[PDB]
Design an enzyme around this catalytic site. Sequence first.
Site, mmCIF file in Angstrom:
data_model
loop_
_atom_site.group_PDB
_atom_site.id
_atom_site.type_symbol
_atom_site.label_atom_id
_atom_site.label_comp_id
_atom_site.label_asym_id
_atom_site.label_seq_id
_atom_site.Cartn_x
_atom_site.Cartn_y
_atom_site.Cartn_z
ATOM 1 N N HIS A 40 -6.480 -4.732 -11.098
ATOM 2 C CA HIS A 40 -7.522 -4.312 -10.163
ATOM 3 C C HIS A 40 -7.099 -3.143 -9.355
ATOM 4 O O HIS A 40 -7.966 -2.548 -8.647
ATOM 5 C CB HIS A 40 -8.059 -5.446 -9.333
ATOM 6 C CG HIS A 40 -7.242 -5.846 -8.179
ATOM 7 N ND1 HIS A 40 -6.326 -6.856 -8.131
ATOM 8 C CD2 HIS A 40 -7.267 -5.328 -6.921
ATOM 9 C CE1 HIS A 40 -5.780 -6.935 -6.942
ATOM 10 N NE2 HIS A 40 -6.367 -6.032 -6.175
ATOM 11 N N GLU A 52 10.426 4.073 -0.668
ATOM 12 C CA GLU A 52 9.630 4.174 0.568
ATOM 13 C C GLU A 52 9.953 3.126 1.572
ATOM 14 O O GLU A 52 10.129 1.964 1.193
ATOM 15 C CB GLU A 52 8.137 4.111 0.294
ATOM 16 C CG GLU A 52 7.544 5.300 -0.354
ATOM 17 C CD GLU A 52 7.309 6.454 0.569
ATOM 18 O OE1 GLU A 52 7.920 6.428 1.711
ATOM 19 O OE2 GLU A 52 6.563 7.414 0.226
ATOM 20 N N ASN A 54 8.695 4.003 5.599
ATOM 21 C CA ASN A 54 7.522 4.545 6.255
ATOM 22 C C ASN A 54 6.772 5.381 5.277
ATOM 23 O O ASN A 54 7.252 6.415 4.853
ATOM 24 C CB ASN A 54 7.955 5.301 7.498
ATOM 25 C CG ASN A 54 6.745 5.643 8.345
ATOM 26 O OD1 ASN A 54 5.697 6.019 7.870
ATOM 27 N ND2 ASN A 54 6.867 5.476 9.668
ATOM 28 N N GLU A 62 13.043 8.821 -0.821
ATOM 29 C CA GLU A 62 11.896 8.721 -1.710
ATOM 30 C C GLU A 62 12.073 9.447 -3.020
ATOM 31 O O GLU A 62 12.777 10.471 -3.113
ATOM 32 C CB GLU A 62 10.653 9.385 -1.051
ATOM 33 C CG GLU A 62 10.208 8.757 0.260
ATOM 34 C CD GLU A 62 10.828 9.352 1.502
ATOM 35 O OE1 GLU A 62 11.827 10.121 1.451
ATOM 36 O OE2 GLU A 62 10.314 8.974 2.580
ATOM 37 N N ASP A 84 -4.778 -10.287 -14.406
ATOM 38 C CA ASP A 84 -4.732 -9.179 -13.404
ATOM 39 C C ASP A 84 -3.372 -8.531 -13.350
ATOM 40 O O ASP A 84 -2.551 -8.750 -12.436
ATOM 41 C CB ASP A 84 -5.167 -9.651 -12.056
ATOM 42 C CG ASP A 84 -5.388 -8.490 -11.077
ATOM 43 O OD1 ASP A 84 -5.486 -7.336 -11.505
ATOM 44 O OD2 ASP A 84 -5.507 -8.793 -9.823
ATOM 45 N N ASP A 171 0.141 -14.638 4.968
ATOM 46 C CA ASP A 171 -0.407 -14.393 3.655
ATOM 47 C C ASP A 171 -0.231 -12.908 3.352
ATOM 48 O O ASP A 171 0.076 -12.102 4.204
ATOM 49 C CB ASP A 171 -1.920 -14.739 3.695
ATOM 50 C CG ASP A 171 -2.612 -14.806 2.344
ATOM 51 O OD1 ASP A 171 -2.012 -14.788 1.254
ATOM 52 O OD2 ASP A 171 -3.844 -15.024 2.466
ATOM 53 N N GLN A 174 -5.311 -7.279 1.907
ATOM 54 C CA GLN A 174 -5.816 -6.070 1.359
ATOM 55 C C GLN A 174 -4.744 -4.945 1.576
ATOM 56 O O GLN A 174 -4.202 -4.731 2.691
ATOM 57 C CB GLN A 174 -7.137 -5.599 2.057
ATOM 58 C CG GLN A 174 -8.308 -6.541 2.574
ATOM 59 C CD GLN A 174 -8.822 -7.896 1.861
ATOM 60 O OE1 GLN A 174 -9.429 -7.912 0.731
ATOM 61 N NE2 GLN A 174 -8.705 -8.972 2.596
ATOM 62 N N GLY A 175 -4.439 -4.234 0.544
ATOM 63 C CA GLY A 175 -3.417 -3.166 0.536
ATOM 64 C C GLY A 175 -2.047 -3.605 0.010
ATOM 65 O O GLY A 175 -1.213 -2.770 -0.341
ATOM 66 N N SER A 177 -2.111 -5.657 -2.659
ATOM 67 C CA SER A 177 -2.508 -5.840 -4.040
ATOM 68 C C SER A 177 -1.599 -5.057 -4.979
ATOM 69 O O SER A 177 -1.216 -3.934 -4.723
ATOM 70 C CB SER A 177 -3.871 -5.267 -4.315
ATOM 71 O OG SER A 177 -4.856 -6.092 -3.785
ATOM 72 N N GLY A 178 -1.169 -5.752 -6.044
ATOM 73 C CA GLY A 178 -0.316 -5.188 -7.036
ATOM 74 C C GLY A 178 1.154 -5.319 -6.749
ATOM 75 O O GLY A 178 1.957 -5.108 -7.660
HETATM 76 CA CA LIG Z 1 8.500 7.764 3.441
HETATM 77 NA NA NA Z 2 10.749 13.290 -5.729
HETATM 78 NA NA NA Z 3 -11.169 -4.047 -11.152
#
Ligand SMILES: [Ca+2]
Ligand code: NA
Ligand code: NA
Length: 223
Positions: A40, A52, A54, A62, A84, A171, A174-175, A177-178
């Site tokens: 999704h 990452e 921040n 990064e 999913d 829990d 939202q955000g 996800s994945g």
């Molecule tokens: Ca960063």
């Molecule tokens: Na890079």
């Molecule tokens: Na979807």
Amino acid sequence: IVGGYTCGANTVPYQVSLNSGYHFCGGSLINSQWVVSAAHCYKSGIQVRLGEDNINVVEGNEQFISASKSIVHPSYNSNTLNNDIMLIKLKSAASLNSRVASISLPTSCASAGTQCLISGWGNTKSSGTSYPDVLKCLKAPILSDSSCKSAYPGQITSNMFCAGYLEGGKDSCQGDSGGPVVCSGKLQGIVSWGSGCAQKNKPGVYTKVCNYVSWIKQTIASN
Ligand SMILES: [Ca+2]
Ligand code: NA
Ligand code: NA
Ligand SMILES: [Br-]
Ligand SMILES: [Br-]
Ligand SMILES: [Br-]
Ligand SMILES: [Br-]
Ligand SMILES: [Br-]
Ligand SMILES: [Br-]
Ligand SMILES: [Br-]
Ligand SMILES: [Br-]
Ligand SMILES: [Br-]
Ligand SMILES: [Br-]
Ligand SMILES: [Br-]
Ligand SMILES: [Br-]
Ligand SMILES: [Br-]
Ligand SMILES: [Br-]
Ligand SMILES: [Br-]
Ligand SMILES: [Br-]
Ligand SMILES: [Br-]
Ligand SMILES: [Br-]
Ligand SMILES: [Br-]
Ligand SMILES: [Br-]
Ligand SMILES: [Br-]
Ligand SMILES: [Br-]
Ligand SMILES: [Br-]
Ligand SMILES: [Br-]
Ligand SMILES: [Br-]
Ligand code: NA
Ligand code: NA
Ligand code: NA
Ligand code: NA
């Protein structure tokens, strides 16, 4: 993550942010070339961001790598959220180090009662909204398949499990996800869905990664 804690920079080294102009989903680095996320979370234009903490500040660890290919599970159903899971191949290999590291795949499924670590940059409020800039973490147990079904009658397939707290308060959201659910050093879950966030009797629902290892391995081998 609602009711969690600040992980600390780079303490979850397999955690990725998927970026399409902005953070939109988590993922998990499973080797130098490949990330696992939720189906999704599919979109075109994904940039994978490794190392990452921040997500709004360059802090020095990064790696920003474009996706070359996104492979949604063949049997993904976006109405039921069955299957999913999605694989993302990086255009170039990550440089692996102490802060950017892969997470092993499971060789068997984890049991109810097992403690896991769930992490992400998603909403931190159960009623409100408030999106963190730094990575958040939650230790939570896998729930019984019987408690999971009872919570979401008619909705839990053999490719899903619940984790969290029936009391509410703690829990994924939202955000998130994945993103990963890691238990004893193995990726057991992907943040998939739930009814609201941190509601009583509505725990998080996660893709059951152990059912997908053969598909993951074969797809990586061929792509
Ligand atoms: Ca960063
Ligand atoms: Na890079
Ligand atoms: Na979807
Ligand atoms: Br904290
Ligand atoms: Br690796
Ligand atoms: Br810097
Ligand atoms: Br690249
Ligand atoms: Br490729
Ligand atoms: Br199919
Ligand atoms: Br749909
Ligand atoms: Br359908
Ligand atoms: Br490469
Ligand atoms: Br490096
Ligand atoms: Br490092
Ligand atoms: Br493997
Ligand atoms: Br295992
Ligand atoms: Br098993
Ligand atoms: Br843990
Ligand atoms: Br918080
Ligand atoms: Br926040
Ligand atoms: Br069970
Ligand atoms: Br049921
Ligand atoms: Br662990
Ligand atoms: Br670990
Ligand atoms: Br699993
Ligand atoms: Br509630
Ligand atoms: Br499969
Ligand atoms: Br399998
Ligand atoms: Na289905
Ligand atoms: Na626990
Ligand atoms: Na923050
Ligand atoms: Na089923």
